[PDB]
Amino acid sequence: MLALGIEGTAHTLGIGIVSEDKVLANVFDTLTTEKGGIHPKEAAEHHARLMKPLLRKALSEAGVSLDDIDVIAFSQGPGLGPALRVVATAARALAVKYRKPIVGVNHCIAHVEITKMFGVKDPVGLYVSGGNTQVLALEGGRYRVFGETLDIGIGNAIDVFARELGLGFPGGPKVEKLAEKGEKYIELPYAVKGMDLSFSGLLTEAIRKYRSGKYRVEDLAYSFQETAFAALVEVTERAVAHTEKDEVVLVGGVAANNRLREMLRIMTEDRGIKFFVPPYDLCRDNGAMIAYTGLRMYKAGISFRLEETIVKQKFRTDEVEIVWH
Ligand SMILES: Nc1ncnc2c1ncn2[C@@H]1O[C@H](COP(=O)(O)OP(=O)(O)OP(=O)(O)O)[C@@H](O)[C@H]1O
Ligand SMILES: [Fe+2]
Numbered sequence: 001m002l003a004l005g006i007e008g009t010a011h012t013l014g015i016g017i018v019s020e021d022k023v024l025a026n027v028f029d030t031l032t033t034e035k036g037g038i039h040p041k042e043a044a045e046h047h048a049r050l051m052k053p054l055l056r057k058a059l060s061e062a063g064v065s066l067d068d069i070d071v072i073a074f075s076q077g078p079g080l081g082p083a084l085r086v087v088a089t090a091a092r093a094l095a096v097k098y099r100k101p102i103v104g105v106n107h108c109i110a111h112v113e114i115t116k117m118f119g120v121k122d123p124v125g126l127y128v129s130g131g132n133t134q135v136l137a138l139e140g141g142r143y144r145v146f147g148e149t150l151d152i153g154i155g156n157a158i159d160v161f162a163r164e165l166g167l168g169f170p171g172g173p174k175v176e177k178l179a180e181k182g183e184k185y186i187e188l189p190y191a192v193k194g195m196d197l198s199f200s201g202l203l204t205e206a207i208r209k210y211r212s213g214k215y216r217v218e219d220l221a222y223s224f225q226e227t228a229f230a231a232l233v234e235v236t237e238r239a240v241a242h243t244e245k246d247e248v249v250l251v252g253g254v255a256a257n258n259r260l261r262e263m264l265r266i267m268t269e270d271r272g273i274k275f276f277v278p279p280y281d282l283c284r285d286n287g288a289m290i291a292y293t294g295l296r297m298y299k300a301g302i303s304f305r306l307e308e309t310i311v312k313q314k315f316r317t318d319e320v321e322i323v324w325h
Contacts, residue, residue, distance in 0.1 A: 001070040003298070004058075004094070005291025008087035009079025009107045010038070010131055013047045015054045016288025017062040017069070018295060021117070025061035026281050026288040027054055036159060036169045038131075044082035051090050058287075066098050073294020076104030077315030078132075084311035092309060101303045103294045107285075108134055108317050109143055111251040113296065114282050114289040120247055122325075123276075124239045126232060126264070129252035129285070130155035133197055135235050136317055137243045138325060143317045146242070147235035150198045154228055155254045157199040161224060164207050165217060175221050176257055182222020186215060191231035195238075202227055229260045233267050240271065247274035255283040300324035 002024070007014040011031040017024040031046040033039060059066065074091035077084055088104075095102040112125035124137045124146075133149040152160070155172060162171020167178075186209065189201045206224050209215055236248060248268050250261065255277055268275040282288060300323050 001295060001299070002064065002068055003071045003073055003291040003295035004066070004069045005073040005105070005287040005289070005294055006087050006091050007075045007107075007285055007287040007290045008043075008047045008083050009075050009077065010083065010285060011043050011046075012285040013050050013054060014285055014287035014290075015058040016286055016291040017058055017064065018117070018288050018291040020295065023117075023282070023288050024064070025058040026286055027058050027061060028281075028286065029054055033169060036163050038080070040080045040082050043080060044086050047083055047086040051086070066094065069098070069100060071103060071294055071298040072100050073103050073105050073290045073297075074309075075107045075110070075290050076309070077107060077312035079107060079313065081311065081313050084313065088309060088311050092306075101298060102309060103297050103302055103304050104309050105290045105293050105297070106315055106317065106320050108132060108136065109320060109322075110289040110293040112136060112143070112249060113293040115249045115251065115276060115278050117292055118276065118278060120249055120276055122245055123247040123249045124236060124243055124245050126236045126248065126250045127252045128154050128232065128250070128254035128260070130159065132252065133199075133232075134317065135239050137239055137245060138322060139243065141323075142321055145317050146239040147195045147197060150193060150196045151200040152203070154197070154199055154232065155252070157203045157228065158224075158254075160203055161206055164210065165221075172254060172257065175225065176259065178218050178221035179225045179259065180222075181218045182216070182220075184216070184219040184222075185226065186219055186223040188223055188227045191228055192234060195235070197231055197235060199228060225259055229257075229263055232260065233263050236264070237267055237271075240273065245273075247276065250275075250277045251283050253284040256280055296324045
């Protein structure tokens with residue numbers, strides 16, 4: 001069967017088309033923010049504008065008509081209200097026009113589920129992006145958050161640090177490059193508070209030290225990553241130890257980071273468990289992961305009535321019963 005997926009929780013609009021086994025099309029367009037930061041209304045306008053263009057490009061790349069599609073899937077949340085609302089409207093408008101069933105998909109769950117297309121069974125998922133940072137796994141018929149960020153996502157924290165260092169958006173790859181040339185570890189506040197992550201204290205200290213003049217920017221970047229990532233690794237390990245799962249997945253836009261991968265590979269091999277990172281177009285926000293999870297949901301007999309499709313800005317990961325596992 002085939003599923004169309006529309007992703008637009010934040011700045012990226014993404015449309016994907018998938019089967020149970022294959023990605024047929026996966027196309028993107030991100031809102032260019034030269035000054036960085038989050039722009040809820042600007043994103044909504046980008047999404048309304050780019051909607052038809054991306055749909056056409058997705059259908060051409062897949063090589064099917066909209067009448068080939070068995071189910072329409074959209075990102076229901078969590079995310080930004082105005083952006084989610086333009087995505088939901090588009091998904092509902094396609095569902096009516098072509099008389100297709102519709103399904104609202106949880107954004108974080110979709111980041112982990114997409115890895116099952118590649119033969120991952122039941123992992124602990126480290127989801128790291130701009131807005132989100134969560135460690136999640138299947139426990140008691142649903143996804144449990146074992147540790148999330150108390151404040152900002154690790155991607156956002158790196159972006160704020162980058163912007164302050166004069167490195168424009170996207171700050172992530174730029175900070176990684178700078179970090180590779182670091183030679184000195186500079187003490188910075190630990191980012192683990194209980195089960196959860198706190199990067200705000202780490203960030204403000206890094207900025208304070210940068211403004212002091214006393215340090216190499218490259219050394220500050222290196223230290224910023226080691227502290228941030230060691231914390232991610234530790235909270236990931238704790239989850240693996242409790243769940244007793246044989247595989248870890250690393251997903252989200254920050255999953256491109258080679259130093260973070262390296263450290264997860266070390267942890268997983270020291271424990272004798274698998275490690276897998278999907279292709280990058282399937283790590284960052286994309287419509288294909290929505291399409292795939294939407295497909296699984298539909299095949300398990302899930303189908304949404306109109307009021308079930310209303311967007312959920314604060315959609316919690318554990319609100320969805322994973323009846324398809
Ligand atoms: N190599 C990298 N190392 C570290 N961070 C990276 C790297 N590549 C991208 N990022 C970060 O990932 C973020 C972008 O991720 P993504 O494309 O998933 O969009 P997003 O808006 O963060 O999605 P969401 O907020 O819905 O999770 C940016 O903060 C960017 O700096
Ligand atoms: Fe995301």
